[PDB]
Structure formats: structure tokens, C-alpha cells
Amino acid sequence: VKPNYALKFTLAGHTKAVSSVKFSPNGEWLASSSADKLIKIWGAYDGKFEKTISGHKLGISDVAWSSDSNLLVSASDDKTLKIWDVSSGKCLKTLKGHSNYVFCCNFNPQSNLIVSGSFDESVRIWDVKTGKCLKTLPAHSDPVSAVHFNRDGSLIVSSSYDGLCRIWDTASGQCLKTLIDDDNPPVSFVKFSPNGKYILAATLDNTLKLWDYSKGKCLKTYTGHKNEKYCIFANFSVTGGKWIVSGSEDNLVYIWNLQTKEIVQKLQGHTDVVISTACHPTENIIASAALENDKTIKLWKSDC
Amino acid sequence: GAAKCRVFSP
Helix, strand or coil: CCCCCEEEEEECCCCCCEEEEEECCCCCEEEEEECCCCEEEEECCCCCEEEEECCCCCCEEEEEECCCCCEEEEEECCCCEEEEECCCCCEEEEECCCCCCEEEEEECCCCCEEEEEECCCCEEEEECCCCCEEEEECCCCCCEEEEEECCCCCEEEEEECCCCEEEEECCCCCEEEEECCCCCCCEEEEEECCCCCEEEEEECCCEEEEEECCCCEEEEEECCCCCCCCCCCEEEECCCCCEEEECCCCCCEEEEECCCCCEEEEECCCCCCEEEEEECCCCCEEEEEECCCCCCEEEEECCC | CCHHHCCCCC
């Protein structure tokens, strides 16, 4: 079995490189963040532009949805995060305290916490309702590329240019686990598997790895794409066949069989580094987005 | 720009 993703829409309108795309948990919306300092909301099924959300003074590197699809959190080069009420577009909070670029962000499943990582080498845990920083973790010795909560919000995984992935206890803020590899290439992305038992980690040696973090064992590797320069996010695709999905610096979307590690499809049509991909939570739909030469978002659909 | 859209390095 192989997927047959086909281009359905190309969404133009960001005036600089796109940095991330995320589907709302309820499946209704796609959100995109850009170096052009904007967030844009699009209809997930018809591609229709919904609205522009603005207020960051510098470009945005990441955006994330609350579990109830009502809020967005964005991370900016202006060293802040912002919490936005989606239906109004109003900024609800500005999260202040990082001393350098904010690179990555996520809500916990309860959506009372936001986790963030920054070029200042720290991971911060923020109270959503007050906007107050609850904890500053001295997580890494170089910029933090990714932060992600597990299924119940009791753990955080972080990754850094320093070459490490770390598993943190959310309530105590203590490091429970450090994944150390020889040759320690920079880690450009990490996230928990849907069941929270594994982590998917990208390194800037053109390599994705599926790890048992409790066992400290690497179960799968995925290769064939190009990832040497940029923090490209990867996804678990679970609505049809079980795939691994990632952008690539050769302008393609790559799709691997999760179990066999074979490449099952390559999506062509972007004209620059595909910096971000996202998988729709209920339909076999992929959103992809690209850097300065392209600046577009593409929606793809498959029967499996 | 944004740091995500630039090469990843300190």
C-alpha cells in the first residue's frame, strides 16, 4: 500500500518565507506563520483565506494551536511569544522573558501551559491564563530547535543544536532522560509519537530517527531526503496508512512507510526548501510550506 | 526574517 497525495491547492499571500503550518485539532483550519511577521488562517478543506493576524514586530518561527482550537501561540524573533484569540484575531497575552529569538512553541493537552524554546538556550514553561513564566529550564548549551508535550502533558521533549534530546518532567522541571549520540550532529526537530512511547528526532545529517527514549534504543531510521541547514518539522501521519512525513532542502515532501522505512512518495511542486509540513487530524491531507523563493503553502490529498 | 527561515546555527 502506498499513498497517492495529489496537489489540491496552492495558497499565496505571505510576503516572505513561510516558517510553519499547523492544522487546528478540530480540522477546520490551517494556520501559517511567516518571516513576514504575520499569521494567516485558511480553510482546511477549500483552501479559502480566512484572515490575517498581526502584531509581532519581527518574523515568526513557529505557531501552535490550543487543544480546543480556540487559541494560537506564536514565537517570534522579537524575543516574545503571543497568545491570540483566533476568532477575534486579538492578542490576548505577550509572553516576555526570553533573551533571544523564540524558535519553537506548543500548548500542553490541557492547554493551561505553553512550552517554548529559544536561541537563549533555555526552555520556558508559561501559565496560559496569566501569561506569567512559571519555569526557566537551563535545558541546553546551544539554540533549542523544538519543544513538545506528550499525550497527557506530564513530559516535555526538547532538542538543540548542541546535539541532545532531553525528556523533562513538566511538574518538577527535572530532566528525566538525555539521549546522547556519538558524532552528535545538531538536532533540528523532535516530537513525541502519538502514543507517547517514542520520539521522532531529526538531525542535520539528513537523517530522521525513531527512538525508544525510555530504552534509549533507536528503532527506525529514515533517509533519502536532504536536511543539512534548516529545522524542518516532521510528522506522524495516522489517518490512513502509517507514514512519516517531512519537508526537504531539495524542495520535495518525503513520505516514508513508518514500519519498513521505505520511501512511499515524494511530492513535487515547491520551488524552495519545504520548511514545514502538517498532517490533518481526520482526513488524509498534508499541508506543506516553503522558504523565500516560493513563499506558498500547498495542500495535498490522498485516498490512503 | 525569522530564525526558522535562516540556517540553524548559533
